[model samples]
Target: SMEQVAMELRLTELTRLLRSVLDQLQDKDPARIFAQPVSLKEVPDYLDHIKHPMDFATMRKRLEAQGYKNLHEFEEDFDLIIDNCMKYNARDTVFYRAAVRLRDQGGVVLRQARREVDSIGLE
Candidate 1:
């Protein structure tokens, strides 16, 4: 009984942490828009300005509207788009590094969630 209680406590802790990440992911848009060096007028155009090879606007809209089924799927698509940019000759990797960092913030939460899942036997 004590072991079951402990396990349930652990489960609740892990679940809360994961829930926090999901909340952060949902809140990113406005923060992301403000964090960038862009005027309010340019907010709508922000994704387009990235110059991603793929239809980033559409993909991002889908994610924001429907949300991702899982963090892994979101990370996969994010990595694919960002990695593709790195693969092609970026005009200035230095200029793009900030964007990379911004994107990596979300990745950090996803990584933490995965770690929690694995360590807690949630997988």
Candidate 2:
């Protein structure tokens, strides 16, 4: 089915990016970073409410708006985001999780749209 195919492709796209990050961090202690969980709530108000280029919420909004057709688009931006987070020492499980969630949510939206089309076909 087209819907399933689309879902699989999106999942693969997201997974590739995530795996890339993991590979990049292979020599580092991800556990140390993951041990300290940051609130998803902190994504927007993080860094003491200071306006910064790496503000998670802002980047997330822009990325989501793009509705990226391929992994490359999201990968570059995600690398920027996580790299900045590490530079500022914003490392946390939630931050990484949120990144995945954003992609996953995008997939959910795709799946929903596919379902809508399927339903229409039944009419």
Candidate 3:
């Protein structure tokens, strides 16, 4: 079953690449604020506007569960957390800049995955 083989390989390679992306993202966070789940106490209305909240730790758990089967799936979660930050914080606030800075670092790594995972022609 080459089809099965190819599918499994796709999952394995993509997962490993995602792990690399996640590692640098975690390290790049100076304040380590978005490194974990956001606290409701920090912003009482946090869940009011944002619907799909995300964080690095939860992303890790999702990755381990093999939930993100595609590069875009992984990127979606990355963007989710950042967008959530910008939405919750004002443009001049620390949280807003943190989200942008984190996005800057991850934006490159994830794009690199575009090429790394795009050229598999083993049909």
Candidate 4:
């Protein structure tokens, strides 16, 4: 079929890239704390302190909705996830420490994804 030439396949390819990226970050969450959005009932002041809360579930749903434009946009959301956790929890807390690991490990995943993106484009 001529459908392959419609450029939709390109979007689907990037979707797989984003999905893999999210899967890696979600898997790397040290305490399984990054799986879902932060609970407001658990932390009543969470929304007040963090302007934007990001999580793996939301990213998956957003990716399913086809909302992302590029790998960088996915990376931005990934950064927000880490930044939000680190910002809301104090440096002395386990949650903050978990985010620390997430931040660094996530860094590696993102770097590899970015590299693949470049490599794909080069060919």
Candidate 5:
């Protein structure tokens, strides 16, 4: 029950945040917005935003770093990497860590996506 309760809370928070972002996007025009540089160091923090256990050897390569250009693309690429990692005993721990990192990053990206949409005037 605790897990369910926490999941509900998480969903509620995500929905509220997404709606706020949508509202902000609706209020502004994206053409006036400029692209800001984001660093790779920040990527892991974004990836591992939540306080979760880290796996090993999942780093050294990342989809966003390769400039895939969108969440769908990134997800597809990551799924392949994870599959490879899972299949290799040497990479299992590493892949597991990467999975956790991926989940954490998803949270960060969800927020980032909202901000981007808002910037583009996604009313």
Candidate 6:
């Protein structure tokens, strides 16, 4: 229920941003950046480490202390986080899809979080 709704909304939000970027690139000169691939459909996993955070137990505890009990809470605050920083976690199924696509593509050079402590810094 909530997860599904969040997924739909997240996809919609990401699609909008991706389109905006593409539109800008198109108007300027698609030749320069069009080939870069409109990766709006792909959102890097900002929460994966949490899935097995024993190594980051201190970090995970901080997230839990902040009330991030599940994926839904994470989704609910995605945008606000993006506003305050340069990174964010995806609230949709695109993450799973992107993971597969990127894996199949066989080369991933981009990182999801630039500075983890910057966007969602430890408290």
Write the residue-wise lDDT of candidate 4 on 7-91 in tens digits. Answer: 5666777888888888888888847788899999988988889998988898999998877868878888988988898888899
In model 2, where do residues sit more than 4 Å from their true spots? Answer: 2-26, 29-31, 34-69, 73-77, 80-123
For 41-99, candidate 6 gives per-residue lDDT tens digits of 35245244232211122323334354443333332333222221222325354433433
User: Candidate 6 — which pairs collide?
Assistant: none
Q: Which stretches of candidate 5 lie over 4 Å from their true place?
A: 1-70, 90-92, 114-123
Give the alpha-carbon lDDT of every model: 0.52, 0.45, 0.84, 0.83, 0.39, 0.33
Off by over 4 Å in 1: 1-57, 64-67, 103-106, 115-123
lDDT of 1 by residue, 1-123 (tens): 998877666555654554566456545444342222333373565455454433234445545553454446555655555454454426576535534654677677777778866675642
Model 6 Cα shift for residue 5 (angstroms): 0.7
Number of the predicted model whose TM-score against the real structure is largest: 4
What value of lDDT does candidate 6 attain over all alpha carbons? 0.33
53-97: candidate 5 lDDT, tens digit per residue: 112112112321333333344345434433433443244464345
TM-score of candidate 6 to 2 decimals: 0.26
Q: Which candidate number has the best lDDT?
A: 3
Worst 10 residues of 6 by lDDT: 106-115
Clashes of 1: 0
C-alpha-based local distance difference test score of model 3: 0.84
For residue 50, give model 4's deviation from the true position in Å.
0.7
Would you give me the overall lDDT of model 1? Answer: 0.52
Write down the TM-score of every candidate: 0.39, 0.28, 0.88, 0.89, 0.28, 0.26
Clash number for model 4? Answer: 0
